[PDB]
Symmetry: T
Subunit: 152 residues, 12 copies
């Protein structure tokens, strides 16, 4: 506690369709964009000596290749795989292959939606899972990650 902390390098990965946040019927579904969420999250992290990086993609390969590039360079991942949660064994195997701990986040409550959304190829190997709490879910994952890495 008394010493300066070591910088944590944390990567946030977002999957398909999350670039649409804030676009359709904003008076109904909300006005906050993904860029707004990540800007806020990057500032929150920087006040705790965390250098937060981000990629969102509709391209599964961009997410896989970014996980590979994270090897021995990133301390922790926060991932919202979106639709690829239910379909991508390749993302599971990238995360197991680089051995970086991660937390799974969803804006929506997947358990209140169709039954196909109730199965995740990541949840069993995640440190934990947050769903249904909106944009704050990313901040909760960041808080969890800092506490896990610094034992606080």
């Amino acid at each position: 506690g008394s010493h300066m902390t070591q910088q944590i390098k944390l990567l946030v990965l977002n999957g398909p369709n999350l670039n649409l946040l804030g676009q359709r019927e904003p008076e109904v579904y909300g006005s906050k964009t993904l860029d707004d969420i990540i800007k806020a999250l990057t500032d929150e992290a920087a006040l705790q000596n965390v250098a937060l990086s981000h990629l969102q993609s509709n391209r599964e390969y961009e997410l896989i290749e970014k996980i590979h590039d994270a090897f021995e360079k990133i301390d922790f991942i926060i991932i919202n795989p979106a639709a690829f949660t239910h379909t991508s064994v390749a993302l599971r195997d990238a995360l197991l292959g680089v051995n970086i701990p991660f937390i799974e986040v969803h804006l929506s409550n997947v358990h209140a939606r169709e039954s196909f959304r109730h199965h995740s190829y990541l949840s069993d190997i995640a440190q934990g899972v947050i769903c249904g709490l909106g944009a704050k879910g990313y901040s909760f994952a960041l808080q969890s990650a800092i506490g896990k890495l610094r034992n606080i």
Copy 2:
């Protein structure tokens, strides 16, 4: 009926392997190419004041990103997702995210093929589904779409 119609903008999306149409054993499986089908369909649409656009891809992301780019620009989609019908939740979520009505088409009768082909991530949110009627399926979807948008 008495007034000039408003132009309809319709996008046709084709998924993987449909670029192979007409290539293998044409005396056995048929000589018509996908370009032949789309040329004919584009002319059929133009005679009814429909501007028909098209993308075929083996790249799921190209299809997702084209759906995103369609937002507030396209009135209706006709999609043959091919193999991605059974696998792509991301395509389901792109179509729900942009809120454009669509019809699902297959050249083959999926119900006569393997059991994995009997489930579609699109069929329940499509306006309707055509399968097994070959290339004419696209024309039937176009006819349906014009009637739905112009109430005829």
Copy 3:
């Protein structure tokens, strides 16, 4: 129509389709089964297709009409309605007379209860149309003409 060989096509409609247009027409639609068949028969005749029709709430009347179609009808368009999910006997009647057919549904069965997702006909149909309303019968007619004339 003149240069072509006449096609003989039978349309079969299952139970409850006689109710089309009856209840809350402002809500569920005004068009009757008679209206759909009149229009379809006119469309067929202009392409040298002689179109016959039977609708029934009696499974046997559909089976027996299929038997009577043997060596007399080129193509069948069938909306079996609720019998789609229940009638093995209709499947075996169609297999027994070996006439190609298309399955049509007005509604999108895939958007409805899971018991409607299974058909005893879809695997042996030439193809299936669902969810496009009454134009689905015209699409089936168009498809049948193209198949039998190679056009």
Copy 4:
């Protein structure tokens, strides 16, 4: 805290959570349920949230506390522990009083036996946190404040 309307929040903990910190603390952890609730109550008070708590191994005490919360509590945070997988009665108590809630688990249920993968609460919760240990209750508190104050 001053400018805000006070929130009344109830935390409910199910069976066996009273054992936290008791067995092999060097191995499974030292922190007790009392330690988690003391900290959580202090965190709530600084944001003008009055936080009440009940833990029980008695399903009825949880049901009856939910009934007593009607028209008196704004939000519930619940870790039903083993009752997550078994108690339809707790589901119906929460539906019956119509208070929004968040489900929390210390452990990652998805990493454990398949019977723990099913919850009678998760579909009607506002959301679910699992696997993040005792900070999950604080995350649920943060979420509840943001939802009720639109912040």
Copy 5:
């Protein structure tokens, strides 16, 4: 047997995450890289008048498009689809569309791993399947392919 053989053109396809071979904890999981395996395999093939080509990708489309480009140019495929074995109907349909015989290989024993890894969209249409025998699996597939094409 007495005549010179006709050259066989064989394509090896590798799916996602196989580029990680040899990288993590090599004293534990092994030091051999995918490039090491393919170099050895290409030399083994060249001594039997087989011209062996290779693509590994984390991009499903690169694998699909390479299969399409193989049409009437390649005699046989060896494929380790990795995670896409369990998920990609599109790869199944590319291989059926070009009608090139193939053998499925896995370094790991998929039957000893999670139940989702027990189903393959390729195994029923492969000539055969090798799993669990490590890098030699590719050599066994090559040996099998030569014998099938030359009737030896």
Copy 6:
């Protein structure tokens, strides 16, 4: 003063056999005996009760179509058709008359194929196992629903 209610009772296949075989074992009451009693009970509360029993699915479907805008409530025991007839479900939905499903026997005590009904989810409610009084209970429920008592 009450407005007359018009109520139709529909009985499916094999219920015409009630009372016929080994009456000392399975009971002596016939379907005609149940319906005569029920028609009298209904008449005392200004309900005009009509009845069809059939082994012909079509006769039940066609009767339901003919009931449109003419009948206030249906009591149906579809017997074996409860587990097999989607067409009866769709007839009842298509005419939009409220109904109650009744079975003399406790279907939940019988083979597992009898545990599912194509009508139970869209019925007002379901009565099983209580013998012939179940039709009386259904009649009482229908009167209370239509007259808000």
Copy 7:
């Protein structure tokens, strides 16, 4: 007539009847239903006793106490219908005939509500007919016990 002793058992959450949004979900309380049913029974020389509880044990222990004291049970186990093998085995152990009643049509609700641990051993089941279901169960019990 010989007096019949009949016990009505109600499971969890039925104490909430009539409390929330009464203009929407209904004004009748469980006490209203039981007071009416107790009167209906007393006019036919039936002594009707009642227990509603959110405590599974209270219902089990009441069933044990009914042994050789009660002629018939009417039970709405509410959520416990789908979960309590212990209630099934309490009813089988005391061998008192019973009818299962639900206010709501369980078949119209989620699939987990389609299965009952009691329905196969009940005399019969009534669902979806609201509070009159308890009256129909009482009528059925009288007819069975008095052969009328």
Copy 8:
């Protein structure tokens, strides 16, 4: 011997036997099979009656009419084997013993044809042996009724 009265019931589509591509699927018609079977029965003092129908009700109503009139039933329900609970309950209701017969081997066909609503309550089942299956069922019925 005492005369036996035996009813043979045939379900849907069996009227098509012998009609389509006879060089491929066979020339024997249902009338050919039944005329032969009626003669085989008459030589053993069995009066054999027959109904084939595509109408489920005709088969149900024939079974009701058989009550206390017929000693044994042979039934090939064809497609109705897999679908008709009503036929099962008609046979259980009149309590006449019966054998189930199919011309084709249902076990070699699609999985929905593997389940019968009649097989568990039949005396026995014959499938796949063609038209001789009806003769074997007749032989079995004679042996059961005359204890031979």
Copy 9:
């Protein structure tokens, strides 16, 4: 004049117990009685009928291998092995002799594990529930198939 048919009857485990326990209850007929009668019936139609019953799966498999090019038709009651032995299925496929599956009891009236057979889909046909006459029916069917009568 007919050509002689050579037919092998195979019986699986526990069928040697026929007739032994509580004969007044379960029957007095032994397997030897059934086979002696069947061998006589076959001989009258110029069929040479051979038999093996075993509790040893291998004795049945090895007999089927030995039948190759020597036996025209098999009648098999695999008893418990019907539900468990893929190896018997593959023996029969490997020698390509037509066969009929017979069971004395109605397997469809018994526990659900008895409802599946590794032989029924590749048999010419299946007879169950008709007691010892089922072997006679199978013999009649085999004669008719081989002689086109």
Copy 10:
């Protein structure tokens, strides 16, 4: 000389009914009779045997919590709770006392919902079907495990 063993027997719902109904049919032995006999058998081998039977799941959970660091071994018949109570599984795991699961009846001969136990995989072992002696067998096993005999 042996060290005393402290052993707790837990009995779940409905076992208080043992011996009550139709004793000429279902048996006359009461739970009190079984426990008195078992307590005497344990005392002869320097085992102090305590007991709770309850229809209240919480009384069983709370007793298991109270056993922590005070009891060497548990014998539990959870009765109906065997098939329903994850909370009892988690109580037993949380105090880490070895246990044996016992049932008087053969659960495998009863309805399929009785075939699954939330305790059987984490028990030392399971005894079913052998009546009241099953508690004696569990006691013998516990003595042998704790004393390595």
Copy 11:
């Protein structure tokens, strides 16, 4: 007492007990367990006979030979528990009561080991308690046969 004749049957691979890594998996051999059990039985005037086999037929044929000769069977079918309908039908055919025993807790092992072809027709089942399970089965058999 009247002498009881009791047969113990052991299935495949139980001959390996005590062979591999005895410091890890245990030193007791099957012959050690059976010699002790034979002595325990002989002190109670039980004649105990034993067969262990990797040959399914040897166990089936031994059960047939037990008919009217043996009062009770204790069986650990090992792998055959999950696979052998033939063993079930041998035990049902000779109608000798039996107890099923496993050394290991099958419920803690793979899901295919959770199902037994014998458990529903056994008198009872013992698993997970090691070699003492055979003694408990012997104690149970004595009590049943002598009403003690």
Copy 12:
């Protein structure tokens, strides 16, 4: 072969494999089991592998041979044929003697009936070869040599 320690390898073949090459050899193939084993034994000997073989239609002969292999055999290659899908006893024999093995099938089981898709051995095998015909045994031999010699 000289510089290496000799490997002792056992090949086990299940039921019906004795029929290889017997029926319609022009159609299903001419090569016999004896031909495969002669060739395999020669291939082994050139790499200082002493190869023993048993084929049987008797499950017990396979079980007992596995028991007899304890502390005497380095590696097993097994084609259990139909017993792959049925024999828990063979699984437990191999687990009981703790000798590593490879499962081989001539045919592609995944292309055949669904009951052939499940193996009681595949999860505990070092690996599995199917569909490659008789060369699969040679591939298994090659794999075993590389594993035991670290080459």
